[PDB]
Amino acid sequence: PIMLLSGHEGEVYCCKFHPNGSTLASAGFDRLILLWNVYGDCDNYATLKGHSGAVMELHYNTDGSMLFSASTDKTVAVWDSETGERVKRLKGHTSFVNSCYPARRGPQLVCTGSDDGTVKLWDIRKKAAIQTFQNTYQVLAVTFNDTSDQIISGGIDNDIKVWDLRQNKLTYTMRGHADSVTGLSLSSEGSYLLSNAMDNTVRVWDVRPFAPKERCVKIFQGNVHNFEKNLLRCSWSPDGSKIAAGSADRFVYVWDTTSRRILYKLPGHAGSINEVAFHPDEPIIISASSDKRLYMGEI
């Protein structure tokens, strides 16, 4: 149907599904995390508590059992979805932690981007930092590589960067973004990475043993920025087929990889859409918008 969700004290910044697609996570300013039933009547059961600043990123594991969350209050935090209660307070982060990324199917570890000037590796078990790559500036987006041997980051220099976990120096830098890097997303191919940026232009790359060394493949038009400079986040389809984006126009942007056409620029919203979640099984979309609600579109 339309299936607009509500109940949030403020703007909804981060939304995603169970890696099952059984229960739903959304959150934003309100410093807690709302969870729902995706199906049925879209029912709203449980709310995680505690995180002092706006919860800047929710991140599942890939099975769907543990919950990582980077909050602006200098900390990342692990929680058990089984409970909703925190397993770790990954502290030590000297400033606003924006991004968190737990490695999928590898050993237990997270790479974290923040507002300090560092990219930080941390272990779930030790309460200890594994590495830290200081490039020079705050780190806004981080996504692994599918071997969990490189760290991808998007910051303020428009120069998308990747670290070697083993050689610890700047492994891949690629450039062509017209302004700051705002969103990274590794497709289910394990290979292609998707990046949004307020500069109205969004880019695709491919991180392989060999890519042409200039790997700007596909480019999409329409994303907007404004005097708000809110966070911009994107995704692939679970099939690597439809490109899902939000923006500050109140239009949700649905493109394809193939013909790169506008598959949809969907209205309906009142607020700037701050995150789109694709369902791991269904043609189901949840649009987290700054109008202090959500949408669930069926396509």
Residues in touch with other proteins (CB under 8 A): 147, 167, 208-210
Nearer to other proteins, 207 or 243 (CB): 207
Nearer to other proteins, 210 or 227 (CB): 210
Nearer to other proteins, 107 or 209 (CB): 209
| Closest CB 191 distance from other proteins, rounded Å | 9
| Closest CB 209 distance from other proteins, rounded Å | 4
- DSSP string of 211-241, one letter each residue: --SS----EEE-----TT-----EE--TTS-
Q: How many residues does the chain have?
A: 299
Q: How far apart are CA 227 and CA 248, in angstroms?
A: 10
Query: Measuring CA to CA, which residue among 229, 234, 274, 227 is closest to residue 29?
Result: 274
Phi, psi of 24 (to 5 degrees): -115, 140
| Closest CB 167 distance from other proteins, rounded Å | 8
Tokens 């490695």 found at: 103
Nearer to other proteins, 124 or 211 (CB): 211
| Closest CB 256 distance from other proteins, rounded Å | 14
Nearer to other proteins, 146 or 291 (CB): 146
- Strand ordering across the sheet containing 262-266: 234-235, 242-245, 252-256, 262-266
